[model samples]
Target chain A: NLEIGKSILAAGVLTNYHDVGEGQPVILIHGSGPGVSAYANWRLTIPALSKFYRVIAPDMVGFGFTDRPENYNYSKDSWVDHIIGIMDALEIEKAHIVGNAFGGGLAIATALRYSERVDRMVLMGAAGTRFDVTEGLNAVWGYTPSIENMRNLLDIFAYDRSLVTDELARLRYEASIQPGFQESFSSMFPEPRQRWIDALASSDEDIKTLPNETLIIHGREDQVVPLSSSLRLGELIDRAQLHVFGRCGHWTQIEQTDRFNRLVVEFFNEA
Target chain B: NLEIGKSILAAGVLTNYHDVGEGQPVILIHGSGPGVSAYANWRLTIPALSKFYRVIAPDMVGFGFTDRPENYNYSKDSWVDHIIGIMDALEIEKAHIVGNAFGGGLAIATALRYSERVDRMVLMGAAGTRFDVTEGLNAVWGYTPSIENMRNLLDIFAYDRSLVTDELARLRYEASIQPGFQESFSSMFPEPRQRWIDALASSDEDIKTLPNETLIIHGREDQVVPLSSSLRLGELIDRAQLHVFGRCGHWTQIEQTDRFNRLVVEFFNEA
Candidate 1:
């Protein structure tokens, strides 16, 4: 039920995406964590953001139910290509873009590469700015299939430890070991992972020149992708605002569910 | 015949290796290319190196017939462990270590990290010192399976045009597309491959302090890993000698097969 999202032949692959509510289109991009799905990342936010704006959240090609072609070249450019393909397939000229951590970097990538395709943008616990890879991120990319390891990852993702119940940990672990899931995730970012972080990042001058209205969000206690990365995003993008949740981790949308949803709605509601 | 090798339970996995000759142990690590097996990289050199010494050429955990464990972490350290594990399994207290290209980097890593385990070392067209990854390397890692593309890769790997015959290209191409061959290769070294290159390298300062009797070899026409890298290695390791093949390319042992194999044995033969 969770993966049975609206499907379309986007990016020359059957893009498993979420399309809900209606008015202006808002592209919701998910993180690069293990077993991550569009719905898994944005389920709580979809209802809130979708009330007024249409939410088009699709899993990136190497990720989720979208095809993982053997010939597919996985890179930021390819990921952006898939996102743009999602828009082109839907015949939407432009849309608002919201990205979280890995997705935040993609949001910036989409906007920088195709400036005309994005409207307002949001980046949460984003990683578009280059920094040393954290132990948290190393653990994320270095993940193997262990419920205990996944539970340990859950601890890093949320400021509120209460969110990590055994039920959620087991479910995420099961999702991680799903046939091709760990293979792609493990391959995407191996050791000396800092380069993958750098590859996803835009040059400071280029990011500073980003022309989109931006809202940057971070967990004050975010460890996975340091709050400094978002702080830098706020500094670089001229027409941008930064919000740090007091007791948040990397999971802003999931942990601080209500306030995050309300904050995103208001940010998008702005003219 | 290419797939079969003597097996040993090293690195807690089944390690397929070629053990020839008998004397002081010599560990032959393979390159990090698609479809590269121990036999592929060392088919010629093993005979030469093993004649006067015990040549133990085994596939690394992520390569060849070695087991790709469900949760293995593929790092330079892990690879070195696999080598050291082979050493431990065979009850050899010390051995001569030789690595080529990707294996070259491993040779440096083995000596540096487990300095006590190595007696003498040789790095040929090796990649232990850090440098920017070349376009040659990008093409090698970026390969998808087509005989033409594999032919192109063969072109870059050698200096003489005669070496890359259609039959050889087809054979390597077939090897490249082996059921699980390309998958592990793709996951090991993806685009923005420079990081993996850097990760494989040790700092010049640490390399300078290396105490083993080292021999560095490079192809004057090497396009994949620059001749400059081995030049730097020559300058850094105090007790080291550099040998450059005038008209050779990345495939040193293959290009200058007779001369190169003779040099390695003669070098290792010395006190």
Candidate 2:
């Protein structure tokens, strides 16, 4: 069943999951962006985390093989509910949630709102924090004066722009053109609440007091969200511990997944 | 000439000493116990600390090559006073102090009572924190009900007992039997001071408000003094940082000199 369901998450469907271990369970949350997919973003982490704990990564709605509802709302609350629904459907009472970028923001929101169901939370380049909006994210995801200049926007997310591979670019470009995608994205983007940032920074105060343990990992050079946000998180959470990776940008969980996985395992095992 | 020097201190002291390096000085205080010499304990660290800052390592009045007067007191305060006198003699305003075992306990006393003279502090397996009364230490130090046994006592200080060569054991055995060695040893024994422990536990509050920086290094498996002693020191000193070396017993700076030297250099070099 595991091998048969392999790549199911990448097949552009609402159904695909895998179980790699029998111990504590971990769930991987995919980020919201044009070319992002659970498998692509978590290519390194899922397999590694699987070695010690059971791992489940699903294609998130609006971005991957998961169904894109034409009339669905794409707010943070909606995504949080979707995860709750998924957990109910999967019969998992609780799970360690790992999120990156937009997914990272969602992970924080979910953990905060649904603290009872979360075993632990790991955030990477989490979105929701108020930062000097990177010109690169705006360039890639925001409107350009002309379609021909769209390539310029795509180059901003990565330091080595050449990594914006042809297949990846095409996949992202295709996803962006889906009907109602623009509206859903605009509504889902947590620009108004910046609540995720404030919640992440101040949430630790109360979260630290919670029975469950928490771990925060961030890249020092994250351009999308300032490292100050992580420092703020550490200050707010009494039990919150932090690991800052030097010379890394917004994609630390992917850029340095080997170390990231090890740290996550060690943190979870500690509690 | 080195053996004939006499110096005045708050506690009666006449000692041989050397001052080297520049900038904020660091005082290297050696341990108690027969055959323990200031020069021998700091053989690896003195020259290294002297490169960037003036390092003053003195032979305490009753130990090393210093005057072993028949009436010299050997309490922590007495050693602290001796160090203060050295600084007074050198006209140095302040310095970072590094001490080991008994020397470590003296350094803590100096920093506690004479804050004005401390720029920073480091203690390795510093004594006077708690009484271990362990069978191991008791057996080696001849504190057991059994007859005096110096051979086993020296072996407990090191990771490799075989390193206690025959020649070294002979010298130690001879030193323990010196005319007044037993009386001096009894006088120097710490009386389990709650005040000293409290001062060390709260050293960080003062360290944080003060301009001085502090660091501590200890062997994880140190049998001479519990590693908890260093951990307590860390909690007491606001800016105190600790590094633990694996497979190392007491005498970390001696057993793992290379790595210890690098750690000190790296820490001090940082702003």
Candidate 3:
């Protein structure tokens, strides 16, 4: 029974999400990926979470139903501007924030730059963590020699090869071919000469200044983003509590949904 | 530490799922859609449910990693045959059946046709519900002239439009264009559709003979298959128990995953 609408953000058309539940607003921000539509990515968790908190997951600029203008620059600052515009449009003065992966980085950035807007923060598999690139991710970036190399990259994500079904792999493959897909893909991917590394290095200053409560969830077996990054993140952020789940990788939210949901519910309930 | 394999079924080739756990075998059948891989569809529920039941979810023929061979007919019987093949391959004499949406219909058919092999059943938004066509779905079948009308049909499955992101919509649209896509689509959404109607009419007799325990969970506002179907299903199945969630839609398992998971777990434990 919520009214859906379209809005312009940062010079790009974006889909605005309405609060589906009636309570304190808790916005769910998605991570980065090609065809990484926030809706599809967060479908498993957000709707269920909506039963308790007012969940609002929007199609961020350059993704999903949101405008992905070819000329629009993909930058963290632009995303910040877009989010601020969304808050203005929705008339949301303040809200609790929960972000996953790339969105986790954005959440940290949001808390830092717009500290007045965030009440609390929950960061899951945050992307600030630095880790060596796996063969599969390398192939995904098309840095590998061929498709064979791509398949090898897929195997590195899981401890069991059975989890990596051909169909799932193909979906990821097909998603990689979407328009402006590679631009964002390469933009997020690591490059030796990239300025992102420098920005990320200096990002700790922002973390130190965050005024809200913080909770960090890390996956011990995370091959994509090493656990050390989470450890470092916990250190940089004041009063940030860290919880690590064993035998889980980058997809800890999915790999341990029950524990994840319950833990989040408990965190949100606490003072 | 599980074995997953590909097997040829009447509709096409299917990837058969296997997971380790204690107690009875539980077959987790997935819903219908283009690129509806078993892994992606059941990743959230299956692993959690697997702790108590040995889970088996097959990428049914004509979808996912399953072979989409030309001339393969995708109908109710074909899917039943695929599960029969899977049970044969796995040497499972019987299993507690859990299904969602199209999979729910298949579960009912399986229990009806192969009563000896079904121990219990859980149907979530089970199709074969009696309802007059609203031209939306018919158009998606390409039977009606207006393609724009198809979005309304697609929107019926969920309670919200935010869930239907452009990326997912595009992927489904692209899959519609795939070779053999239309044939399979038409097969699933045939004109007249009396075949499924007849099957549903006979479900009463089928349930009468079924000795297995049954549990049905549905959303009150389920547009894909209305609440009345769940009520009818409850009446048909002698020992079936039903739970209806308020303000939910066809995708109840996801819309109410926590409660859905807990209910299934409790039911399975009792069984």
Q: Which candidate comes out best when scored by DockQ? A: 2
The prediction achieving the highest TM-score against the true structure is 1
TM-score of each: 0.50, 0.49, 0.46
Q: What range of 10 consecutive residues in model 1 chain B has the weakest lDDT sum?
A: B238-247
Alpha-carbon RMSD, each predicted model: 23.7, 13.9, 23.7
lDDT of each: 0.84, 0.62, 0.65
Candidate 2 chain B superposition, TM-score? 0.80
Better of 1 and 3 by lDDT: 1
In order of listing, the candidates' clash counts read: 2, 11, 2
Point out the higher-scoring one by lDDT: 2 or 3.
3
Once fitted onto the true fold, the runs of candidate 2 whose alpha carbons sit more than 4 angstroms away are A1-271, B1-12, B68-74, B128-133, B136-148, B190-211
Query: lDDT of model 3 at residue B65?
Result: 54
Query: lDDT per residue, candidate 3, A1-271, as tens digits?
Result: 1212344453345565545676877877876645555665566677667778877777677665576666777677777777767777777788888887677877877777788998888888775544454443344344322334334555654545576777766665555555666555666555552344334332666667666767787666666556667667766776555656545666666766766776576567664
- How much DockQ does model 3 earn? 0.01
How well does candidate 2 score on lDDT at residue B265? 61
- Candidate 1 lDDT by residue in tens digits, B147-188: 998899999998887878899889988888876878888888
lDDT of 3 by residue, B7-107 (tens): 43432354555455666898888776543556646767876788878887777776655566567666788788888888887788999888886788888
Cα error, residue B210 of model 2, in Å, equals 6.5
* Residue range A136-210, candidate 1, lDDT tens digits: 999998998999999999999987898899999999999998889999889988779999999999999999778
